[PDB]
Amino acid sequence: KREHWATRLGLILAMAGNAVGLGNFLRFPVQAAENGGGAFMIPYIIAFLLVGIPLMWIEWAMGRYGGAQGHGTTPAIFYLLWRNRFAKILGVFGLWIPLVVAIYYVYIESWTLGFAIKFLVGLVPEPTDPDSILRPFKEFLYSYIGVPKGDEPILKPSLFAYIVFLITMFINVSILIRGISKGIERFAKIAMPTLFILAVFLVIRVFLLETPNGTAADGLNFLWTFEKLKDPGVWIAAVGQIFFTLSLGFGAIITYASYVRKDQDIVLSGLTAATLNEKAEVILGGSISIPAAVAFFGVANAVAIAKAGAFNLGFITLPAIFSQTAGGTFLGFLWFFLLFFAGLTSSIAIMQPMIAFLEDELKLSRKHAVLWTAAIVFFSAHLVMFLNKSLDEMDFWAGTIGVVFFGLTELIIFFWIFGADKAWEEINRGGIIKVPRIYYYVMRYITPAFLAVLLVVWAREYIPTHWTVWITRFYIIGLFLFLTFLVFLAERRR
Numbered sequence: 001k002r003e004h005w006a007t008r009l010g011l012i013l014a015m016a017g018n019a020v021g022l023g024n025f026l027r028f029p030v031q032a033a034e035n036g037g038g039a040f041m042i043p044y045i046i047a048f049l050l051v052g053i054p055l056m057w058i059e060w061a062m063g064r065y066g067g068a069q070g071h072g073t074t075p076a077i078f079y080l081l082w083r084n085r086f087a088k089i090l091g092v093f094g095l096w097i098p099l100v101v102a103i104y105y106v107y108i109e110s111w112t113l114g115f116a117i118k119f120l121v122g123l124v125p126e127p128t129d130p131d132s133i134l135r136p137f138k139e140f141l142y143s144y145i146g147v148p149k150g151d152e153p154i155l156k157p158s159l160f161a162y163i164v165f166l167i168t169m170f171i172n173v174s175i176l177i178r179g180i181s182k183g184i185e186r187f188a189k190i191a192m193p194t195l196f197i198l199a200v201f202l203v204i205r206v207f208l209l210e211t212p213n214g215t216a217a218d219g220l221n222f223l224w225t226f227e228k229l230k231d232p233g234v235w236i237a238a239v240g241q242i243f244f245t246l247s248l249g250f251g252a253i254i255t256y257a258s259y260v261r262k263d264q265d266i267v268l269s270g271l272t273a274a275t276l277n278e279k280a281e282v283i284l285g286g287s288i289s290i291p292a293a294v295a296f297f298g299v300a301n302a303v304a305i306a307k308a309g310a311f312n313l314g315f316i317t318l319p320a321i322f323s324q325t326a327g328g329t330f331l332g333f334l335w336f337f338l339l340f341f342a343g344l345t346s347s348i349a350i351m352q353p354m355i356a357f358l359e360d361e362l363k364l365s366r367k368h369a370v371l372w373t374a375a376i377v378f379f380s381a382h383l384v385m386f387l388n389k390s391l392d393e394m395d396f397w398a399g400t401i402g403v404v405f406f407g408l409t410e411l412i413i414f415f416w417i418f419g420a421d422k423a424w425e426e427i428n429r430g431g432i433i434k435v436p437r438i439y440y441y442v443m444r445y446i447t448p449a450f451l452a453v454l455l456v457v458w459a460r461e462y463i464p465t466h467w468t469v470w471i472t473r474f475y476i477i478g479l480f481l482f483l484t485f486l487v488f489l490a491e492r493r494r
C-alpha cells in the first residue's frame with residue numbers, strides 16, 4: 001500500500017538529518033554571535049522546550065494520521081483534520097513552502113560540492129591583516145556565484161558552478177528515485193554517522209588553533225556567558241532559530257511521518273531525533289566556526305564578522321582561516337564536504353512533499369514523481385542563478401515568514417479545529433513513552449502565543465525597490481497558483 005521505514009534507527013537518523021542541513025552546522029553560532037553567548041542559550045533552549053518540542057510532535061502526529069489515510073501532503077491532511085474547502089487552499093502552502101525552498105536550497109548545496117572539489121584538487125586562492133586574506137576568497141566565491149560588480153541585476157554563474165548544479169540535482173534524484181527505504185533511509189544511515197565523525201574531527205582540530213591575535217578557547221568562552229534577556233529582541237531571534245533547528249513549518253516532518261506505520265511510536269522517536277539536532281547544533285556546530293573565527297580575528301571582531309553573514313563566515317571567512325593553518329587545504333575539503341552531505345539529507349527531504357503529492361494525489365509512479373519534481377526544481381532554479389535578489393526574496397517568503405505562519409496553522413488545525421483532546425490521543429498513541437501532560441497546556445495556549453508574537457513583530461517591521469524582486473514574487477505566486485491547479489486536478493479525480 002504505502003512505503004514504510006524499515007528501521008526505527010534509520011527513521012530517527014533520516015528525521016534528524018533533514019534539519020542538519022538547514023544551516024545549523026554554521027547557523028547557530030551566527031545567530032548566537034549576534035546575540036552573544038550565554039545570552040542566546042537561555043531563550044533558545046527555552047524556545048526549544050516551549051515551541052520546537054511541542055510543534056515537532058504536532059507535525060509527527062499529523063503526518064502519521066495522514067499516512068494511515070494514505071496522504072503524506074498538507075492539502076489532503078488539512079481536509080481530514082478540517083472538512084472545509086478553505087483548508088485545501090491553505091494546504092497548498094505546505095506544498096508551496098518546501099518547493100520554493102528547494103528551488104534555492106539545492107543551488108546553495110551545489111556551492112559546497114563545487115568548493116569541496118576545488119579544495120580537494122587544490123584549485124583554491126592562496127595568499128597578517130583580515131582584509132588582505134579575505135578579498136581573494138570573497139572574489140573566489142563571487143566569481144563562482146557570478147555576483148556582478150556592485151548593483152547590476154544579472155548574475156554570470158560559472159560554467160563549473162552550472163555543471164555542478166546538474167551533478168547535485170542528479171545525486172538527489174539517485175537517492176529519491178529509490179524511495180524511502182532503499183533511498184533516504186539507506187543514505188541517512190550512511191550520512192549521519194559520516195557527519196558525526198567529520199564534525200567531531202573538525203571540532204578537535206579547530207580546538208587546537210592558536211594565533212597571536214587570539215585563541216580558539218576564547219571563542220568557546222564567548223558562546224557560554226541579561227540585560228539582553230530583558231531586551232525583547234533576543235526572544236525573537238531564538239524562536240525563529242528553533243524552526244531551522246528542527247525543520248518546523250517546512251512540512252518535511254509531516255511527509256516523513258506519513259511513512260510511519262499506524263501504531264508505531266512518535267513520542268520517543270521524535271524527541272530522540274529532536275535531541276540529535278540539539279546535540280549536533282549546540283556542540284558540533286558551536287565549536288567549529290566561531291572558535292576558529294575568534295582564534296584568528298580576536299573575540300571582538302568575530303561578533304562583528306558574524307553580523308556580516310553566514311555565507312561570509314561559512315564560504316569566505318572560514319576557508320580563509322584554513323588556508324593559513326597547517327593542512328590546511330584539507331580542512332576546507334572537510335568543512336564543505338560536511339556541508340554538502342548535510343545538504344543532501346535536507347535537499348532530499350525538502351523535495352519529498354512534492355514527490356509524495358504526485359504519488360498520493362495524482363497517482364504518478366515514483367519514478368515519474370521524482371523526475372517531474374526534479375524538473376520543476378531544476379527549471380525554476382535558473383531564476384535564482386541569474387537574478388541578483390531572487391535567492392533573498394524566496395528565502396524571505398518561503399524560508400522565513402512562511403515557515404512560521406505555517407507552523408501556526410498546524411497548531412490551530414490540529415489542536416483547535418480538530419479538537420485538542422482528540423489530538424492528544426493521536427500524539428501519544430502507541431508511544432513507548434508518552435508526553436508530559438504539562439505540554440497539553442503549552443501546545444494549546446503557550447506555543448500558539450509565541451508563534452503569534454513572532455508574526456506581528458515582523459509585520460510591524462515589514463508592513464511598510466529593485467525591479468528584479470517583482471519577477472521573483474510574480475514567479476512564486478504562479479507556483480502557488482500552479483500547485484492549486486494540481487490540488488484541483490487531483491480533487492476532481494475522485
Ligand SMILES: CCCCCCCCO[C@@H]1O[C@H](CO)[C@@H](O)[C@H](O)[C@H]1O
Pocket residue numbers: 021022023024027030108109112308309310311339340343395399400
Ligand atoms: C548547505 C547550505 C549552507 C547553509 C547556509 C544557510 C544558513 C542560513 O544563513 C542565514 O540565512 C538567513 C536567512 O533567513 C540570513 O538572514 C542570514 O544572513 C544567514 O546567516
Ligand SMILES: CCCCCCCCO[C@@H]1O[C@H](CO)[C@@H](O)[C@H](O)[C@H]1O
Pocket residue numbers: 156157158159162
Ligand atoms: C541541460 C539543461 C539546460 C541547458 C541549457 C542551459 C543554458 C545555460 O547554460 C549556461 O552555459 C554557459 C557556458 O559558458 C555558462 O556561462 C552559464 O553560466 C550557463 O548558465
Ligand SMILES: CCCCCCCCO[C@@H]1O[C@H](CO)[C@@H](O)[C@H](O)[C@H]1O
Pocket residue numbers: 009013189192193195196199276280284
Ligand atoms: C552530525 C551530528 C549528528 C550525528 C548523528 C549520529 C547518529 C548516531 O549514529 C548511530 O548511533 C547508534 C548508537 O547510538 C548506532 O547504533 C548506529 O549504528 C549509528 O548509525
Ligand SMILES: CCCCCCCCO[C@@H]1O[C@H](CO)[C@@H](O)[C@H](O)[C@H]1O
Pocket residue numbers: 365368371372375
Ligand atoms: C520530464 C520528466 C518525464 C519523465 C520521464 C519519463 C520517461 C518515459 O517513462 C517511461 O514510462 C513507462 C511506464 O512506466 C516505463 O515503462 C518506461 O521505462 C519509461 O521509459
